[PDB]
C-alpha cells in the first residue's frame, strides 16, 4: 500500500467540533492514533430523515491526516438538523438557514 491510504474508521479521535468559522462551512479537525500516516479521511454526512444520501458537500475533496492529525475538514450542509460520521464517530450539527420544514 502507498502512504496515501485510508485511515481506520475506529482511530479517530476529536480535535476541533464543526463550526462555521464566519464562511457559511462547517469546519472540524480531527486527529488519527493509527498507523499508515499521513492518510486519507472517511469523511460522511446526513440529515435527519435522510439515511441513504450523503448529504455532506465536502469542500475539500480529499480530507487527510498528518502526523498527529490536523484533519481539517469543511463542508457545508442544508439547514436543519445534521449528522456528521467521521470514521465510527458521529456528531450531529444543526445548521441554521431557509429549509423547508413540512
Known amino acids: ?35 499508515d500516516k499521513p492518510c486519507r479521511i472517511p469523511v460522511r454526512a446526513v440529515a435527519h430523515g435522510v439515511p441513504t444520501i450523503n448529504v455532506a458537500m465536502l469542500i475539500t475533496p480529499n480530507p487527510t491526516i498528518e502526523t498527529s492529525g490536523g484533519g481539517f475538514i469543511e463542508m457545508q450542509l ?15 450539527w444543526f445548521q441554521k438557514g431557509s429549509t423547508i420544514g413540512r
Open 78 to 92: 442544508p439547514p436543519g438538523d445534521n449528522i456528521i460520521y467521521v470514521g465510527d464517530l458521529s456528531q450531529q
Open 1 to 35: 500500500s502507498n502512504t496515501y491510504s485510508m485511515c481506520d474508521k475506529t482511530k479517530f479521535k476529536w480535535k476541533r467540533v464543526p463550526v462555521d468559522s464566519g464562511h457559511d462551512t462547517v469546519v472540524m479537525e480531527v486527529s488519527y492514533t493509527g498507523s
